[PDB]
């Protein structure tokens, strides 16, 4: 209720991090600052890597740079740097998630028709709303927070 909890500490301890883009999308790396607000960072082309100077105990989420589609890193949602034990840089293998076929079909249609034509399509009622409900990071953080609260 006070501060959002999906956030990074100011641990001041450096950490070597490498983002690998094992996805066909243009990945957008995102760092949540010490207040929970997401900071975007330069995009990653598909199949490319990059060493990144982040810090021990930060948070990183990755999305499609154009569509904001959700992406998994190391098979999970968020990524946490840590100590570099004996040289070792930390790998953040960004991957696609196994989308639901519904959300996947919306992904394609959203990339063909553009907003004002979402309601120019002869489809069932509760689908224009799903088309207009684009993937949102700020709301997926609210969801990701609300999910684990019950645990």
């Amino acid at each position: 209720r006070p501060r959002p909890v999906l956030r990074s500490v100011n641990s001041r301890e450096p950490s070597q991090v490498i983002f690998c883009n094992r996805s066909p999308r243009v990945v957008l790396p995102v760092w949540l600052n010490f207040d929970g607000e997401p900071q975007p960072y330069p995009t990653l082309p598909p199949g490319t890597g990059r060493r990144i100077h982040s810090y021990r105990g930060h948070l990183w989420l990755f999305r499609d740079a154009g569509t904001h589609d959700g992406l998994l890193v190391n098979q999970t949602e968020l990524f946490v740097p840590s100590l570099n034990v004996d040289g070792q840089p930390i790998f953040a293998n960004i991957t696609l998630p196994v989308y639901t076929l519904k959300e996947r079909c919306l992904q394609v249609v959203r990339s063909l028709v553009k907003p004002e034509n979402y309601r120019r399509l002869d489809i069932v009622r509760s689908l224009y709303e799903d088309l207009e409900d684009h993937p949102n990071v700020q709301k997926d953080l609210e969801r990701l927070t609300q999910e684990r609260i019950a645990h």
Binding site: R1, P2, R3, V5, L6, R7, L59, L78, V80, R148
Partner: peptide, 17 residues
Amino acid sequence: DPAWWNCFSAAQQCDAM
């Protein structure tokens, strides 16, 4: 457990003392 499950839970306990 994922590395961010601990990142969340440690904040909740620290932030809301």
